[PDB]
């Protein structure tokens, strides 16, 4: 599909069985999801943004479906105000920027 | 052009007669550039992101050339970790997300 940028590019994604709304973010290297109790082993990580850094939990090889498009990879979980789909997953669904 | 996301989507922009490198960011409502001098009056503003909020200077109706395409809009200047072109200007150059 083709998504215009008049409003925030939010789409539905499926992870850990739950359906959530997430922002297609070309400005994020990684995918960061709001705090949620995901099972599995994880590693600590710090990610930076505007303002500073926050601590998050890193989970590897987590299946994520974006608009019916299947992907799998690293997902970071922490105190973010919005669910963010970064480039690590965007490249997997053949997403590009065009103008 | 069509831009893939295996690497950060950086492009050259020209503003105030200067050339700079900026990140095409669909996850940002506004455009925020690193501290620099710009003609005109500016109003203090605050914007937020992953690691909290920061104080920025707001300049209105500023011409910005992005990859050869012209845009004229609001440009925020402050202590951002990187130059960011947000949706306010991305929509002006007809940018979209596709997959």
């Amino acid at each position: 599909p083709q998504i215009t940028l008049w409003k925030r590019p939010l789409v539905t994604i499926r992870i850990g069985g739950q359906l959530k709304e997430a922002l297609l973010n070309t400005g994020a290297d990684d995918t960061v999801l709001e705090e949620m109790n995901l099972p599995g082993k994880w590693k600590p990580k710090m990610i930076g943004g505007i303002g500073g850094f926050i601590k998050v939990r890193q989970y590897d090889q987590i299946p994520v479906e974006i608009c019916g498009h299947k992907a799998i990879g690293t997902v970071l979980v922490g105190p973010t105000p919005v669910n963010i789909i970064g480039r690590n997953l965007l490249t997997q669904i053949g997403c590009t920027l065009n103008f | 052009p069509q831009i893939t996301l295996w690497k950060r989507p950086l492009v050259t922009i020209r503003i105030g007669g200067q050339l700079k490198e900026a990140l095409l960011n669909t996850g940002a409502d506004d455009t925020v550039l690193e501290e620099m001098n710009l003609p005109g009056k500016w109003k203090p503003k605050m914007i937020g992101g992953i690691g909290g909020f920061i104080k920025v200077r707001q300049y209105d109706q500023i011409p910005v050339e992005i990859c050869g395409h012209k845009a004229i809009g609001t440009v925020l200047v402050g202590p951002t970790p990187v130059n960011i072109i947000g949706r306010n200007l991305l929509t002006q150059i007809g940018c979209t997300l596709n997959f």
């Binding site: 994020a28 960061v32 930076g48 963010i84 | 960011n25 940002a28 409502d29 925020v32």
Partner: peptide
């Protein structure tokens, strides 16, 4: 507004 730049470092 909200600027969600994320540095994977």
């Amino acid at each position: 507004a909200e600027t969600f730049y994320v540095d994977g470092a």
